[PDB]
Amino acid sequence: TTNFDQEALLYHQQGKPGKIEVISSKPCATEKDLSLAYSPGVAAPCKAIAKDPAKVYDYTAKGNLVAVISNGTAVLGLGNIGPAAGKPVMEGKGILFKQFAGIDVFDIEVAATDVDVFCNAVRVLEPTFGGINLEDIKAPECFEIEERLKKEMNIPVFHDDQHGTAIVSGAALLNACSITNRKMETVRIVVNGAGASANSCAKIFIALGARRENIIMCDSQGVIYKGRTAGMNKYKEYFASETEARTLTEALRGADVFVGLSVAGALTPEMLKDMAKDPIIFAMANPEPEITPDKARAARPDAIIATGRSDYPNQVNNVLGFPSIFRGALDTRSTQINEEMKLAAVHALAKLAREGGKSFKFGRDYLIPKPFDTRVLLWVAPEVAKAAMKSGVATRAIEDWDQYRESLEALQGPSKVFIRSAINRVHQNSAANGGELPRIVFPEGTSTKVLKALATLVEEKICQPILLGYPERVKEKIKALDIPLLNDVSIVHPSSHPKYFSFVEKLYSLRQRKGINLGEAERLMADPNYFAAMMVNQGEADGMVSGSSINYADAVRPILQTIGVYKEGIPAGLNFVLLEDKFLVLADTTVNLNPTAEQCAQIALQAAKIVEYFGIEPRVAMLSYSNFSGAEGTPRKMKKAAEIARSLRPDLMIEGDMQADTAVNPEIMERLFPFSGLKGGANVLVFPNLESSNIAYKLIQQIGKAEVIGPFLTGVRRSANVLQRTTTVDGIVNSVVFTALEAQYIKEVLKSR
Amino acid sequence: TNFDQEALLYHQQGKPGKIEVISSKPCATEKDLSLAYSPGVAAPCKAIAKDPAKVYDYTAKGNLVAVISNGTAVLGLGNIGPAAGKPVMEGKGILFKQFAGIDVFDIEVAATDVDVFCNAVRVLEPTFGGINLEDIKAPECFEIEERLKKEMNIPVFHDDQHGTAIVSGAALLNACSITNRKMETVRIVVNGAGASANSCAKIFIALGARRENIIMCDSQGVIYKGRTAGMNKYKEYFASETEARTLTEALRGADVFVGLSVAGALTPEMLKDMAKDPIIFAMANPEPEITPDKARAARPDAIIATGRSDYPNQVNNVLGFPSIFRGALDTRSTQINEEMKLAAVHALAKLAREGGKSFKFGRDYLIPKPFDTRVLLWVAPEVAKAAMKSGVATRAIEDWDQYRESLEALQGPSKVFIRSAINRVHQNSAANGGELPRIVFPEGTSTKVLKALATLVEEKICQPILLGYPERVKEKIKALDIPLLNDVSIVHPSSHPKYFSFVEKLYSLRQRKGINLGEAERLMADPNYFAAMMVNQGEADGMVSGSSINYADAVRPILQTIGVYKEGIPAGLNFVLLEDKFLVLADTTVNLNPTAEQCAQIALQAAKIVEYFGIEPRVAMLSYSNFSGAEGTPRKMKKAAEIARSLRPDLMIEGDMQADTAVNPEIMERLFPFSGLKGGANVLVFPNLESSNIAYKLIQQIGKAEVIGPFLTGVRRSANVLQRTTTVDGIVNSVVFTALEAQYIKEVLKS
Ligand SMILES: CC(=O)SCCNC(=O)CCNC(=O)[C@H](O)C(C)(C)COP(=O)(O)OP(=O)(O)OC[C@H]1O[C@@H](n2cnc3c(N)ncnc32)[C@H](O)[C@@H]1OP(=O)(O)O
Ligand SMILES: CC(=O)SCCNC(=O)CCNC(=O)[C@H](O)C(C)(C)COP(=O)(O)OP(=O)(O)OC[C@H]1O[C@@H](n2cnc3c(N)ncnc32)[C@H](O)[C@@H]1OP(=O)(O)O
């Protein structure tokens, strides 16, 4: 079938099949380690737990192990396809738990559509798990199953499909009512859809203060009125209204809030006209919402809008709810997830939306936190903890809350969140600038890697790409690769660009005494690399990305000739290694073969200032094959480099010469060279020659199991980066994210002066 | 209680428990999640809905085993409960991952009733590729297993029932082969009616024993046909028509005793009256029915197996389930039938009757050791073959070499490289009459060195010789409380008999390099110089230094004393132990800026070492460039590769190239298919000391791979200098490989 589907298929099938693997968190390499992990040593925890059962939480994974359980009768938007065919989404859901709350998950697909047998099978699994996440079970069975297992089991039971939308949209409505000066007891709500999510929406809205009579529920047969027989059951009567309205159009007349849990296009302009002033629209249907935010505001300008789409503001995404909720539950070793806790989550999210460089402004286009916000865990998980204890369902009290947030941050390290946060920041930047995306030029307009990355990139609003090349030939490669998301992208052929000759004049004037006269300037300016560099220089672009298809020197050279270094700056490649507790910055990985002490120092200063952009204390090591010897050669160079750097930046920890492990490992430093002023391990590593840097970062990238992003060109006046030609597509995507950042930053600085 | 306390903290420290579920694929970024979850995840779903079998292609199913228990028969603690059994189930899981690379969900079920238990497990089938029932008390377990085996279409296997049967079965085959018995005539009595017994009888009969020649006993005595007292459906399976009623009566003239019982049950009288060449399987835990020394005291002709590791012929289940399930899953089988269990038995037995060299088949080696790295490669394919032949397989394995490759991928260097080294050292010693390698450690007062030596002498790795003032070294040894080193030889250099002969030698070597006799004497008083000379003159087999001194100062007296072999160059070499492969990095320590020629020779040295471990070396000359050959190191590395290829035309040697280009074959094929390096490189030669040194140290710290070394190559005798940043575990590894280098050199010298 399609391209994206094929990618997903290969994603699941390549290497190890599936998306999860169960590994040891403790040593198990030697026979002794196994004598502790298994017999005869493993008897010790058992004996303990046998005598004091609660201690299962102390000696086993339970305190962080959640079950994602399903019979696959309501998978995503695919319906009743079976448990086995539902296994990939349950593995996926597990991944969300791990990435957002650091929770371990076993995905359990049960072959039981009978409620009775499903519950009998699951109930009895309780000793194994810290909590149960029911997922993708069709209505009305899911209601019966969750209600039953919620009490029969002494660990939390939570069907996300029912309550996620209710919780998140609950927060969104709290804030929207606050903006429009509504009080909920008077708010008239209409819910369209009778799936698993609808009932929980009405209940949560009432828990927040809305009145039942002011809420009207609809399904495929229309308004769910009291006394209806056609297509009803026990649970659809739970919120049947005694309203006179019978069609969807009639329920929404003079209405305040629309909660759409149905089908695309279901909400019509006629319906919109007859809502109350400042109508609140939740169009949560999948794959397309009941109406797009643009159509809704087109019909009625005072509207407030939320979707399940990330393309549009106010995305309600279930990922805002279950990770923090289960987190709070597990850390308090709670017996359930009750209404007090769900409400605690609702309010925590809502409050979070209502409160470095830029930040999202609270308003009609910002009603709830963004999914890639690292603070949701920090804010929500503890309020859930608090609510669990206050309700008495917690069995373990949390006393030190700061210490608790430390424990939560540890769960959210750079290997999980750095890129996520970068992307968010790009979004805060564009949003805070009236929404324009940075204009980024790609001189390699026919590069397969580049076009494929741009698909991802344009879809997620990271930049506005401009491609360079012959328009017919690039439109052709784009069609051959079947990437339709790029039919709008600007394509420019340099020689026929209107600003071409002014560009050549500029290059000429810049390099007329460096071997480039008008003839030659014209020649060079016809080259996309040069044209791109000049667009960036002249402000016709906010940044540029090249080198996907040629060696670094050739790609970087026009950048250095056109844009040049800023005062005292030095052109230098820099990469991030995204580890779990920290990230390391490596420089210079691309430009300088054999930098002097002076040059190494400046590189250090540049990397340092970048690290600071990310709110980290840079701690710098000048790497060598030597430990504090200062011997003739590389040792003296790196020692002097550290000395110079410290003189220009006396506030920073900068040390050298030292070996790499001495540098990154603080115990080694304290045990062997405690006189060193570098403490806590360095996070910035500058190399003595191009061999060491280029080789190190590439090896780490290939055989280490840590993401590394870059190289990023530092030292230059305007925004430009040269990819490693060995890059992957996902690599280019990460690169362009950070180029979008650099571009946004530099544009901001230019607009100040 | 101290071992107990250690185990407790082991479980309590860091993350509670012993397991965590991690992603095997990228899933941090927006794109990655759009593939791991909605909307991309719809694609595999839609596929599986269409063809349920594809659940094996797009999910962990084909490598996921449930270790399921209710905690009614946990280890040797009995009916202790589901929550209390959780630690051993996680543990069992760790064993699955380590011995077969199988992922496991530990499932502790709160159900003592057979019908509800079975109803809960039956319905989990879509989740797992197989079910390993564990620690469920008899007789429930019998009913449960038979039932779920019928009801479920994925393999069902209660290891407690069949493990001892299978392993001791292999053992019995071999023991009978040594003693020239045919199974048809062998008289067996098995003592104990636990979960293990019936399956023992069943497997023995499958191997050729007659039901009539087998007697079962429990606490009340012989299980005869027509006995009523305390019998049940399953104790009837092997009721004998024997006239014997006591155990002692059954064992009279018997060939085999299978003890699945209690300590002391086998007595000299019943033992005296077993047949000639009695076979004793004393597998009670914690203590055997009888110790091997006492059984041989009573009957010298006895062959003995225990469940304990202290003694030869250990019967341990860990030899069974990992390959059994491996074979099962890889053929995507619907069950584990008797045919497969037998395949396991026969393969285990054959493997024992066959690293560089191995053990001697006889009465003290009837089966492989539990930690034999050959087991998975040997057993899993025979299980698979049996699975296919018996029709329970749903996916045929076509290429057996491709399959053994895949199993090697599962049991890669990160799990077994050091293990195999240790085994190889042991077998070298063993094949050479038990002499341990003489390794001299000049830093006799180094705490890190002493701590490593504890493990080293404990594990029969070498004969250490410490250097320093005997007083101060014993003083520190007592201070650190390491009692295993009260026997170790300690030498004060100037007080050694061969001291002056050593100084003369140094003199004659360096009399024209700035050293006359006085100076020679003076230097030879230095432990580093003394150690070097000791190794040189053969008064030691090797040396390891550099724990408390910088590398240059440590390595210099070695190079001045022992020196390089012809055409050789001193070079530091490291291994990176990854999961699919190991990488070799050189030269990581000595040469600041090796020439092309030097880089070539370094390459050759690394190559020969890799070949020593049975790998095809593939060499990349690293640069900041891809096949540019520009002035500078690119040119140097291109030339280096050309020279290497000239000296070893049979090898894949290529350059100049970047590191990702080198280790990654896709990059290479995508960008530089003209190159002669195919399949990724495993030997990486660096253009300078900065790059090599920084690389191995960085990888070691932030990478998640063990890195071992540096090892000094190019020198005439076995000597290595540690990185001063080494940890103690680092020193034990280093000394392992030093022992190997030492053994090898001694062997070639005797030629
Ligand atoms: C991602 C990867 O895999 S990276 C691959 C490994 N790295 C490489 O292949 C690149 C290695 N380095 C080089 O090739 C060279 O140092 C280059 C290309 C960066 C310099 O280019 P050269 O051909 O030597 O001189 P060139 O005229 O092109 O210099 C470019 C411009 O920037 C300036 N410039 C170049 N390098 C520097 C530097 N370290 N510091 C300050 N200014 C510099 C120059 O002055 C020049 O501007 P100007 O001539 O108008 O004054
Ligand atoms: C694990 C880690 O962290 S390593 C840290 C980084 N590595 C280092 O710091 C060591 C840096 N390298 C060096 O300092 C030098 O290369 C050393 C120590 C290897 C040798 O340096 P020198 O001071 O010249 O040694 P020295 O002059 O005493 O001679 C060494 C002996 O070995 C020989 N030798 C030394 N290097 C070599 C070589 N690459 N090739 C062949 N022979 C050599 C010499 O012939 C000499 O013997 P000779 O006296 O008969 O001529």
Automatic annotation (TrEMBL), chain A:
Gene symbol of the encoding locus: mdh
Enzyme class, UniProt record, top EC level: oxidoreductase
The UniProt record lists the keyword Metal-binding: yes
Organism encoding this protein: Bdellovibrio bacteriovorus (strain ATCC 15356 / DSM 50701 / NCIMB 9529 / HD100)
Chain positions recorded as NADP(+) 1 binding sites: 165, 194, 196-197, 220, 236, 262, 286, 316
Record's keyword terms, sorted: Metal-binding, Nucleotide-binding, Oxidoreductase
Residues at which Mg(2+) binds: 135-136, 161
Any GO MF annotation of the entry: metal ion binding
Residues annotated as domain Malic enzyme NAD-binding: 162-389
Name the UniProt record assigns to this protein: Malate dehydrogenase
Residues holding NADP(+) 2: 194, 196-197, 220, 236, 286, 316, 318
EC number(s) stated in the UniProt entry for this protein: 1.1.1.40
Positions of acetyl-CoA binding: 511, 514, 557, 561, 590-592, 659, 694, 697-698
Automatic annotation (TrEMBL), chain B:
Keyword vocabulary terms for this entry: Metal-binding, Nucleotide-binding, Oxidoreductase
Domain Malic enzyme NAD-binding: 161-388
Family matches, as InterPro entries: Aminoacid_DH-like_N_sf, Malate_Decarboxylase, Malic_N_dom, Malic_N_dom_sf, Malic_NAD-bd, Malic_NAD-bd_bact_type, NAD(P)-bd_dom_sf, P_AcTrfase_dom1
GO molecular-function terms, A-Z: acyltransferase activity; malate dehydrogenase (decarboxylating) (NADP+) activity; metal ion binding; NAD binding
Record Pfam families: malic, Malic_M, PTA_PTB
Keyword match Metal-binding: yes
Positions that bind NADP(+) 1: 164, 193, 195-196, 219, 235, 261, 285, 315
Its EC number(s): 1.1.1.40
Enzymatic class: oxidoreductase
Sequence positions that bind NADP(+) 2: 193, 195-196, 219, 235, 285, 315, 317
Superkingdom of origin organism: Bacteria
Residues the entry annotates as binding Mg(2+): 134-135, 160
Annotated positions binding acetyl-CoA: 510, 513, 556, 560, 589-591, 658, 693, 696-697
PANTHER family: NADP-DEPENDENT MALIC ENZYME (PTHR43237)
Protein name: Malate dehydrogenase
